[PDB]
Amino acid sequence: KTRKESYAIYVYKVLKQVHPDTGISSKAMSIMNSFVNDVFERIAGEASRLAHYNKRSTITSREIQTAVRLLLPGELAKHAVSEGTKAVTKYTSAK
Template sequence: MRIDETEGELAAGAINDYDSDISEANDWSDEMKMAIAALGRGMGPLKIPSYRKRQDLDKAYRKRRRRVPMGIRPRTIMEAGTFRPMYRRVLKEFHPEMLLSQQSVIAVDDYMGLVLARLVQIASGLASNHYGGCLDARDIQTAVRLLFPDKLGILAVSSGTKAVTEMIQLDKNMNPNES
């Protein structure tokens, strides 16, 4: 690029202005003076490293970040409304050689959310038909039978009943004095 004489004079005047400003500020470092002079020449802003600030931040970061042994670390908290950590565990239990990608976990989680929302919608419609309007186990079973086809609905109802029965038995074994 070629600089005209008028632009050159303007640039020289700007440099002189910056130089006079720099000479007034005695507490600035040489790096700061160079950066301001570079701005006056049209070179653009220079990034000036602040070593003292960086060292202070590193010390503060090291103080805050403590290594915790693996056995003491808290488990990851599940997001509200998702079962994402559970899909990989269940798959590993039945098919240890298979893996799930992040996209497939998201897709399965979205599908499960839709199915559960539809189940709740059907069950709440059934509950509003009878006295009391409270969801009952019978309403959930009927909603499952209506939502899923023939054998899949029957299998889902029997598996759910079995799981609830096991949980009740486990609760009775843990707290024998309550019932």
């Protein structure tokens, strides 16, 4: 019978990271899940558009990084950017 995936457990665990004592509501989780999708939707559109404008078959980290700096104001962008490169560093240094 029917099945559907979510982001919910990740958000939930991230909540427990920031505020282990703190709870949430399904309504809020629904809002968060939609929000997560919309951000992904926005980034991917740019990443596609960038690759096309750069005659590129292949999206990679550059497209995400620059798309983020296009989509986000402020140090919020650069925090995210640095986490991205950091996470990519961990990934690339990991095996």
